[PDB]
Symmetry: C3
Subunit: 282 residues, 3 copies
């Protein structure tokens, strides 16, 4: 091609191929690699996929059942998107693990196709433009494990609900990785504490006669922290390290919104380019 | 010396030291490190060495006995080379493995000496010019395990023979590594297919109801592919991944010629600087 | 603060906090990480700490009992230092291993505090100025093993004594690591030899009918070698590789002075910024 140029068309009215029920093309395939590193860290067995005329969404549940993941890629932020209707697919994560891991900078495009012709097949095409090498994967997919809780959970990450979480701040992926890696050296639970008003966010654990550790954020503005906690009321929850480390180590994005409510439920929002990644830990 | 200059004299009429049956000096010692990484990957037991007044050649077979390696370093492309006559040596690869692995950029010169004086000894000298540090290895070597097949194999790689292989192309070392690492995630055999004419090179494997994978090179000119296959004839062979991955992972050179014939025999030619490396997989 | 400024006060007349028996602050926390990597490599169980109004010193003995480490950080080369008197502390290395390993470039300051109030506690504060994140460790410390040998050993490293070691030279950490890693591939003991006069330093080992190795420093000036050995007298000792590799791999400094005496005792002096590190191997 041009060597020493891909456009973003968004959703299309019709597919190039006629038998295509879904056509997807995107110029940042590393998004998918980091997305499935996350699924691997979570030890997810099956990935549920919902395709609609506007976007494609991947659903998963961590092995422990504590975490739910909702990862949506928006048709209009993507290089090429068409979907005929709303339909669902199941993918075995172990089957596609190494395929997604084989994505590197030599590929500048990822293409996903599903045809009526081949209703049990999902195509993943990776293109190396240096040598016009096309790498096509034919993946056998099931009809999904139609999970009744996916209604409640997509409900749970709505705008009306999130604004009522009284404690929220932002981390870079590196900062999230550093905090919860260090914590994992010494504990499986950390306490998150915030006095109402303009006092610092406190993260700590206490082991008697050995080691206590206290992490304190003395400038709320520098982590984009905002508190709704009534003045002189104490917010205090305990959260598990493991699943958070899984997300942070996956480095899926660059900035991550953290949302806490008083009964211990966390929500992580990491939004990068076309991907909006949501983690609900109940 | 001069710090903040080595010449290439080629083959010499006479040796510096009088008792030297072989004198070899070269300013790219990393060549030898990557060569013996390859021998390690192959699990080669013994390396056969033939010295002649013009060049030195290393011979080995892999453990699985499918592959034979011929690595020749040309006297005239080297900084300093003398050999009195044709003679042979055997080297235990396990004995010298860590030696060759200890080569790094702090060494700017490798020297190899064999004296009549010490007929069972091979000297390897590595020179660090920053601090004028000379690292001398005295390696005990044997009388070669004189392998009758080395006559057939060195013939099989003449170019009278080679220019009749009907399918040939070129990869960078990192392209070869990428193809056969990805393949090795899912299969031990890959099919190589090429229709006669100007159709694409096809690499693929098929597993029913799980995963099929197809790699296709849509521009033969970009991999320097040339086909001798009659119009509308199908060339199709199956090749083992393992030994090819061993060569590719060793990254011995920048570009590699791949040559295929119809009964499944491959030849890999990776030529870098003074070293011409040949892999025959029968 | 100021982003796109820390001063070196040295010793203070009196402490900021009134209950502080020790206040220590330093702008190169990686010094402590590499120090405790060294202690880990040595498999040190307990670290003895002596605080005085002028400096703080860490003592350790390797597991094998061969090596003694004395690491003193000078109050006057540090950003902030106060100590009320001479007192001693014991630290379990396993307890603080991961804490010291959690130091990275995101921390620009390390602070160490000991108060009369909490006498069995040692505070380590790491500050991330990008987001004003303070990470405070509360470490439980013991009263120290009263070790008789620490008197003899701090004497053994005095200037008066060191001047009589007849063989001394300097390595970069990268040179020390290279020499004793390569050596460790093939031997546990190396012979150090130096003829009196201006002959080269010799390091070698000899295994019959397999491999001998000789590394020779042909320019004493380039390793800052100075010999006190009478002309035509042979200095020859054997030294263990393991503990030297531990020091070299820890990369604690950039230059390391090596001192040898005729009965086989070595002393390593690695001095970087505030830290003066001494290794006595008897």
């Amino acid at each position: 091609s041009m060597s020493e140029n891909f456009e973003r068309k968004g959703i299309l009215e019709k597919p190039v191929r006629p038998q295509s029920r879904l056509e997807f093309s995107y110029d940042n395939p590393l998004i998918f690699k980091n997305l499935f590193i996350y699924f691997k860290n979570l030890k997810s067995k099956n990935i549920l996929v919902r395709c609609t005329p506007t976007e494609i969404t991947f659903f998963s549940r961590d092995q422990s059942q504590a975490s739910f993941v909702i990862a949506t890629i928006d048709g209009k932020n993507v290089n090429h998107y068409y979907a005929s209707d709303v339909f669902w697919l199941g993918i075995n994560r172990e089957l596609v693990e190494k395929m997604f891991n084989s994505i590197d900078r030599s590929f500048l495009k990822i293409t996903i196709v599903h045809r009526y012709d081949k209703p049990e097949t999902l195509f993943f095409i990776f293109t190396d433009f240096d040598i016009d090498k096309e790498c096509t994967y034919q993946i056998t997919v099931s009809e999904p494990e139609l999970d009744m809780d996916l209604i409640e959970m997509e409900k749970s990450i709505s705008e009306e609900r999130l604004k009522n979480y009284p404690l929220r701040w932002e981390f870079t992926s590196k900062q999230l990785k550093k905090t919860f890696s260090d914590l994992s050296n010494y504990t499986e639970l950390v306490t998150i504490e915030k006095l109402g008003g303009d006092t610092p966010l406190h993260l700590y654990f206490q082991k008697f006669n050995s080691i206590s550790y206290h992490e304190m954020y003395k400038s709320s503005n520098k982590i984009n922290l905002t508190s709704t906690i009534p003045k002189s009321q104490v917010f205090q929850i305990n959260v598990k390290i493991a699943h958070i480390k899984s997300l942070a180590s996956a480095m899926v994005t660059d900035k991550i919104r953290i949302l806490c409510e008083e009964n211990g439920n966390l929500i992580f929002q990491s939004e990068m380019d076309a991907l909006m990644l949501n983690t609900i830990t109940l």
